[PDB]
Amino acid sequence: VIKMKSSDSLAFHRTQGLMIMKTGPNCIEHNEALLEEAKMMNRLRHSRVVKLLGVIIEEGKYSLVMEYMEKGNLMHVLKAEMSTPLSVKGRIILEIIEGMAYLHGKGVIHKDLKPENILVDNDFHIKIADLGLASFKMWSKLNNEETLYYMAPEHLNDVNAKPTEKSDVYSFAVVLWAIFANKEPYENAIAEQQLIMAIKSGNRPDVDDITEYCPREIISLMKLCWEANPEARPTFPGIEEKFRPFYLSQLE
């Protein structure tokens, strides 16, 4: 089931086309649990969510195979020479909301939503990725064996609090900012105790640090989504209800 061979990093699959792949002694004790987890994550099927295409479960060699995304991540695309128009940026936002509302609907809480986890195709359409394996516990353990700017403040200096749907809504708010500032927030200052405590105090990325035009509605949306109280933040279906009419009438 959903098993690949190395005989079948950018990888040209033998029969099913272009794909992205991410590659220790074999431990038969965890192979069944890894295969079960990949099958589980493979059940996540949405137009704006990255599709986990396959796995390579071989002796001492483990790999995860996802689909190809030509233009790389959202930060790479924003920091490019050619500027991205408001209509494209607004579409990217709507697609992020859709992909996140799908994940939340399937009980998946991202925990690590950031521009590096938003992949872009040639046609500037996006897909939500989990490149840091935050939603794979079995496979994350293999990766570790012998950025905090998008993190909700309830998790900063508090590892034990269980993340929620509202933890992702906070991350979205900073992605929203980054889309308009065309850069990473907080002047790219090393994640420090000064910075963590400041964010916890109430500090947010500088809205006035956005030089290009950002509509009134999008500033309100990011300010509402990065609220200190998680209960005051909207849901992704809630955000969609307001954002889809705004994109159609004003941004498209």
Ligand SMILES: Cc1nnc(N2CCC(C(=O)N3NCC[C@H]3c3cc(F)cc(F)c3)CC2)o1
């Ligand atoms: C190279 C390379 N480096 N990493 C990988 N992976 C690991 C992440 C995988 C991934 O994005 N997903 N798995 C299936 C659905 C999707 C997903 C998206 C979310 F927004 C949240 C999720 F919980 C899961 C793709 C393969 O391949």
